[PDB]
Amino acid sequence: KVFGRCELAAAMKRHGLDNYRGYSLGNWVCAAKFESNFNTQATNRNTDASTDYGILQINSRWWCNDGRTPGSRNLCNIPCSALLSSDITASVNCAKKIVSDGNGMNAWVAWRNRCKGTDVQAWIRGCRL
């Protein structure tokens, strides 16, 4: 499912991401935008053979199990395919664990590189939240 900007913002808010761990909603929407372009089915394989899954491009080396990643830890205790669902609940619960891991949203390279320090409020502008 390819989400609309305001649509995703509302679902993320409903799921308790607005200001979760200090990061406003604009940060999460911006992150999803550059990580997956709002597409729940996005996947990207990496050089270390792990793969990033879903709307927030969660990695198979530590967060989920895809059955094909060397030394995966599966911290979110879920099969990676669950992150591709049209229902973002699994992705949100796992992202909450990742962002709490010590490095905050810097865990998401696209966030650090394209969202960090920018006017993230623009991502929820015009939405009825």
Please state the residue numbers annotated as binding site: 101
Asked if 76 and 64 touch (Cβ cutoff 8 Å), the reply is yes
CA–CA separation, 93 vs 76, rounded Å?
A: 8
Question: How many separate domains does the chain show?
Answer: 1
Catalytic positions are: 35, 52
Q: What is the CATH number of the domain that holds 121?
A: 1.10.530.10
Domain containing residue 36 = 1-129
Q: What angle do CA 106, 107, 111 make, to 5 degrees?
A: 55
Please give the C-alpha separations between residue 23 and each of 26, 29, 42, 107, in angstroms, as whole numbers.
Answer: 8, 11, 23, 13
Resolution for this experimental structure (Å)? 1.8
Question: Which of 47, 41, 15, 23 has the alpha carbon at shortest distance from 107?
Answer: 23
Tell me, letter by letter, the H, E, C secondary structure of the chain.
CECCHHHHHHHHHHCCCCCECCECHHHHHHHHHHHHCCECCCEEECCCCCEEECCCCEECCCCCECCCCCCCCCCCCCEHHHHHCCCCHHHHHHHHHHHCCCCHHHHCHHHHHHHCCCCHHHHHCCCCC
Please state the residue numbers annotated as binding site for substrate: 101
CB atoms within 10 A of CB 110: 17
CA–CA separation, 27 vs 39, rounded Å?
A: 17
Token duo for residue 113: 């590189």
Q: What angle do CA 79, 80, 83 make, to 5 degrees?
A: 110
CA–CA separation, 88 vs 101, rounded Å?
A: 20
CA–CA separation, 54 vs 43, rounded Å?
A: 6
